[PDB]
Amino acid sequence: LSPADKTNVKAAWGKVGAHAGEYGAEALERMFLSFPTTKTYFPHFDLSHGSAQVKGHGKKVADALTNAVAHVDDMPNALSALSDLHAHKLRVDPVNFKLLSHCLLVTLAAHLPAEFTPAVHASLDKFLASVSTVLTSKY
Amino acid sequence: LSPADKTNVKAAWGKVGAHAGEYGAEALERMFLSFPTTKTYFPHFDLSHGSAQVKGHGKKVADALTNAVAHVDDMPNALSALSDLHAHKLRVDPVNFKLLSHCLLVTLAAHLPAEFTPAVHASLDKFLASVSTVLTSKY
Amino acid sequence: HLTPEEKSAVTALWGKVNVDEVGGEALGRLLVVYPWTQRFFESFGDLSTPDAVMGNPKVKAHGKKVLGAFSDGLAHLDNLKGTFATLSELHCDKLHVDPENFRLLGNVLVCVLAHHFGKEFTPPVQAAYQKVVAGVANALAHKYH
Amino acid sequence: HLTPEEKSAVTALWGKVNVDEVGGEALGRLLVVYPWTQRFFESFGDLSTPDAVMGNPKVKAHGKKVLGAFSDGLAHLDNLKGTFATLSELHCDKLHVDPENFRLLGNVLVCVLAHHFGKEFTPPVQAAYQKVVAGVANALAHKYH
Ligand code: HEM
Ligand code: HEM
Ligand code: HEM
Ligand code: HEM
Secondary structure, eight states: OOHHHHHHHHHHHHHHGGGHHHHHHHHHHHHHHHOGGGGGGOTTSOOSTTOHHHHHHHHHHHHHHHHHHHTGGGHHHHTHHHHHIIIIIIOOOTHHHHHHHHHHHHHHHHHOTTTOOHHHHHHHHHHHHHHHHHHTTTO | OOHHHHHHHHHHHHHHGGGHHHHHHHHHHHHHHHOGGGGGGOTTSOOSTTOHHHHHHHHHHHHHHHHHHHTTTSHHHHTHHHHHIIIIIIOOOTHHHHHHHHHHHHHHHHHOTTTOOHHHHHHHHHHHHHHHHHHTSOO | OOOHHHHHHHHHHHHTOOTTTHHHHHHHHHHHHSGGGGGGGGGGOOOSSHHHHHTOHHHHHHHHHHHHHHHHHHHTGGGHHHHTHHHHHIIIIIIOOOHHHHHHHHHHHHHHHHHHHGGGSOHHHHHHHHHHHHHHHHHHTGGGO | OOOHHHHHHHHHHHHTOOTTTHHHHHHHHHHHHSGGGGGGGGGGOOOSSHHHHHTOHHHHHHHHHHHHHHHHHHHOTTOHHHHTHHHHHHHHHTSOOOTHHHHHHHHHHHHHHHHHHGGGSOHHHHHHHHHHHHHHHHHHTGGGO
């Protein structure tokens, strides 16, 4: 992750702004619709459209991503508890992280047309990839 | 990785000993036979059985792996030139790194039956995965 | 396997797609985001900078051809395997392109459609298009199966 | 697509495979090396340690069943898709196993065969067995295609 990537990601996530929780909920909804095998990880969840549980989970995921953007240089230390949770208690298959990264990128492209230049797209792809490796680093 | 992973990998690669170049040549031959799409990366090579070019390349790969074992705590700094080569000049598709890792594991299993316990297998798989991520971190 | 509503939505959205720019955008974004794919296009000239990639006439024309292939596949959703037989031959036996790159390009195209259509690219529309691009990649990768 | 020599070599090597231990060993090694696959076997007891995994009677019996399925697939190399239709249904529409784990298990089995047979597991034999396990994984992943 280069300093240009860091600048691009910080700018894009700043223009995301206070819409982060809604964007994360939308990304989770897109993941559930496009890849229904991802829904098996939320057996006790209500995953219908407009669900408050999905809203809250999207807010949590977005806040974790905001913290990661705040700590790009210290992501492994910032995401240690999350990595522990996902890799050990959840046992989440690492392909689902690619799926969620793609859905997050699609949400960002659909909501920020001007910001989604090819360079910003590459920077966000690399940032979400690094987040995924940190969350799967305990395997 | 882990300290136990480091101990297991060091023990296995020490048991490899002075057969490292031959083992690397065998792993490259296995990769060429099982995965013919890998051969495209080496067009000016004679890739027939017993080829001296494949012997020398296997020696080079094995020596790089020995250096990585010796610098398991500083692999990104030890493998910087190699990562630059493979990502910028050669532009190797990252799936071939998984292919070569599998062929190396198969060579190790076939040559060291006693050493290839499940724990050593897991440690070696983790070590080769980390080597692959270091070599693919410069696109 | 698209429902009639999914097929209707996909066709309606594809009706408004610029057949001259979208394929070049998708191909250039693939080359920028996954720069190991540039190895297949070394005869296309300068690809060092994102600006150079997105300003390449060769990239634009090749993306036009790829978009035309996608349109042909969309017009024959029930015969994807037979539609892409020649292209599967060309990509596997001649170019040795890993099938993972087909899904990478399909996801890049989904991102480009989202970027172009905004709020109209709803999650159901995205799910239908994900099914479409997965089918296209599977049909293109048949030679390795 | 196996040549007659590849088929003969695969059959000859499989004739010497211990049908009571190899499958359990391969399944246990899959669980140890890819610990997220343990998610699918939480009714199997203790899997916290590699020793506990390789000492699990449930793992041994399930590995026996998986090895029997592999032997059945090897007996019909030209009808892998039809041989694994019921198992593909079970793994996809009931278990939701990502098809990457099928290739992971095939590669673990290749490693186990190498560890058991040593010098007999020549690179040509390994290439034939890689073809076999790739075909088996493709047949098992048909439901998602
Ligand atoms: C960028 C990627 C991801 C981020 C930032 C993320 C973030 C989070 C956060 C913040 C939590 C709540 C932890 C807590 O409250 O202590 C959580 C829980 C959880 N995550 Fe993720 N996650 C990611 C990827 C995934 C994926 C790909 C899946 C499955 C396909 C997944 C499944 C779960 C599950 C099942 C929970 C438990 C929530 C519950 O049971 O209430 N996560 N994640
Ligand atoms: C553990 C993984 C790998 C290691 C340790 C490794 C190591 C090396 C080394 C030491 C060199 C020589 C560099 C020099 O002489 O300065 C090299 C070159 C090269 N490698 Fe790798 N490599 C790995 C993976 C791969 C893979 C997976 C491929 C392709 C499928 C590949 C393709 C090449 C090519 C084409 C060259 C150029 C050699 C020549 O043109 O003479 N490498 N590698
Ligand atoms: C995923 C969907 C894809 C579609 C629908 C597609 C479609 C096409 C089409 C229509 C052509 C022109 C064939 C001709 O002019 O005779 C072509 C050629 C080519 N494609 Fe693809 N392509 C796809 C993916 C890829 C990817 C991912 C790569 C590389 C990473 C790639 C590399 C090439 C190359 C190098 C050629 C030039 C070969 C030639 O023109 O004869 N393609 N493809
Ligand atoms: C790759 C080749 C594989 C083969 C040939 C195979 C074969 C089998 C067989 C024969 C059964 C028994 C079905 C029955 O008793 O009715 C089974 C069940 C099962 N398999 Fe697989 N398997 C494979 C891969 C996997 C993988 C990679 C996983 C998990 C990561 C998995 C998870 C399961 C589970 C949880 C069951 C129990 C489900 C049930 O019996 O209802 N399998 N498989």
